Amino acid sequence: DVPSKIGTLLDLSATELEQVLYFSKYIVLDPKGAILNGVPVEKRQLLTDEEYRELRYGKQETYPLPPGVDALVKDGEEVVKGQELAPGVVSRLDGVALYRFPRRVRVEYVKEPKDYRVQPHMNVVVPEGARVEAGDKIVAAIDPEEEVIAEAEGVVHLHEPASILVVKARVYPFEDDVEVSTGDRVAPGDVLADGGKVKSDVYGRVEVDLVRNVVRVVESYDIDARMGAEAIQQLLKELDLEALEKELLEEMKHPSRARRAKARKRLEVVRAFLDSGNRPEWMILEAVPVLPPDLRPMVQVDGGRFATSDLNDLYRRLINRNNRLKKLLAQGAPEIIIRNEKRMLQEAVD
Amino acid sequence: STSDPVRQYLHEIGQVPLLTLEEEVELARKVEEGMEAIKKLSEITGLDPDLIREVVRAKILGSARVLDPKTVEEIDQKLKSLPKEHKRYLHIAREGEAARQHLIEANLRLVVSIAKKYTGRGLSFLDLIQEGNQGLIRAVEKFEYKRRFKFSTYATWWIRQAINRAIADQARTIRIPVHMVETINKLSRTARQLQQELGREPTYEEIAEAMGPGWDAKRVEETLKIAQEPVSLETPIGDEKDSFYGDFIPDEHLPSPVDAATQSLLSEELEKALSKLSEREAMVLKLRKGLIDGREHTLEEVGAFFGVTRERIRQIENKALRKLKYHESRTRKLRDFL
DNA sequence: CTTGACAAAAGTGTTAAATTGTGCTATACTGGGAGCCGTCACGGATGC
DNA sequence: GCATCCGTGAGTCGAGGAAGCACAATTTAACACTTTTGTCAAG
């Protein structure tokens, strides 16, 4: 309803409100010391999906090497932007380079560059440059008949990666048990493993690689950004109408007529809530009233046929979508699915 | 498109690259390994396997998701207090839980391709996609990579099943059980085949014969009567949309002014007729016929109020009923109400 | 007013159908589909 | 100032009314029996 009451109180444009309410952009509620492109992130800032993903999960990219070729970089070596990983592929961000699926493992027996072939249904169980005593497993497979083990002692070398993963992270080697787990979030100075011998020096998401027995901290921030009416209700609950009115009144003395014209429009809405006793967050619905059944009847006509009102169909859609969202939340469904369900629930209420 | 929910959803699912053969196998193996690791964790700590998986899932999904968080943090700490050999299963559980999320997110195009073939059957395109997504989540739970079958071959079964069950459960205002929905669909197919073979609409006898044993013309007709959707009360009638079905349907629940008055007139006349009776005879009839408390009392219950035996109450009521009959005959002021 | 037969008149309790809810299929399948189009007034809001 | 956009408004009565199956779980139906209730004649 132009001009929107929610937008006027929160100072959001018609487009900005729609983007948040229908899950197109994020709105920052707690930057958590997040920096985006060299600038600190500030509260009430709108983030696109790519910006949120970069801030919340970091920067990484996978480059598929052509079959047969061998990369010019080793597993676990830092790269810079523009560096050539393989003979024909060049990275676009600096970070740790990781072999995704090594197609050939070349062990060096001591008495001998024996080689073994790696297939998609097989996975290597040892890191690069590892000494293998005669008998230890090297490449695992579904069928033990094709499983690969080491006849004698040697050094395992991995070659021919299926693709190269460039991840902006910090690699922390460890020897004893790690005090963190995959998915945990850490801040500088937090202990990672070995009783404080290894500690985080940057924000990020901690992921433990047991094959490489290292701790990777994917540089990222624990920023609090949300979409939909849950974010808007968070802003509307935080409003101090007393404080907002005082600021608006001060801006009512600005020389410009447009500034005072806008301030009057905002303060008229602020005054309405202050005088009536209503709360701004009541403009977001948590419980939806249901009309009495006799005002939306499902009646049997003289011929025995049933006639019903349109409100029953609109209620059924909202209930079906609400129930489905509860099931998806109980299943721990990915964020993409949940966002679609929440966006559909908002539309069903509308 | 901000205005188009479907275009917005397609763009979002297009931001996750498709999985290759090697990528799919590792994700499936990690999911399989994580579930085995979770089962071992429950055995070692004795905790409920569901609780362990929920705690692991909460840690992976992060703090952006609304058992309170403190209990999760407590179970997380207890798991992390295990020795290194037992912490290895916790690491495997976390990796497997993350793999489950990426395997699901990478196959959201598969549901859309399957779901576009089910439109026009009562559910909207986005409703079909979300129901299909639920089958895709179920497929990841049961998919077995040891069999060397690709994910789409096994997942397509669950995606279709979820969409079809959703249609059977949500496509009608008056829900018909799934088994009855199957009967309706089969009957429509049989009639359509007969119609294209007889060069006309088949009768119930032809449809019943083609359906098989246990079917007759009566059953075919009752099933067709069962499958009639309600009509909208707001459907327009006429070229100018100012009249609707609801404007022509009378209300037959509330009594009419004429019905209410005749009920009140009868009560007044019956009250006067009961005046000619004795003080106790009127009470007996009013108690037995439910003219006082609203509900009929019995001879024994009536006797309980008055302290008389069951047989006597029956006779006194009968005499009073005979009295009233005599009065009515001599006046005939109460026969019109019958 | 009782006082004992009586008989349905009704209710309680199992049991077996009949109905209904639910899980499951293993070649590989991976981003939709329908508008299309002859009116004219006003505010009011924003793109600036 | 300014276009361009969207949103709201445009007479009254009347007459026309597309899986299939398996199996488990729940509900409905049909007995069975006992337990009121209603009459009876008395007494």
Curated annotation (Swiss-Prot), chain A:
<protein>
    <recommendedName>
        <fullName>DNA-directed RNA polymerase subunit beta'</fullName>
    </recommendedName>
</protein>
<comment type="similarity">
    <text>Belongs to the RNA polymerase beta' chain family.</text>
</comment>
<comment type="function">
    <text>DNA-dependent RNA polymerase catalyzes the transcription of DNA into RNA using the four ribonucleoside triphosphates as substrates.</text>
</comment>
<comment type="subunit">
    <text>The RNAP catalytic core consists of 2 alpha, 1 beta, 1 beta' and 1 omega subunit. When a sigma factor is associated with the core the holoenzyme is formed, which can initiate transcription.</text>
</comment>
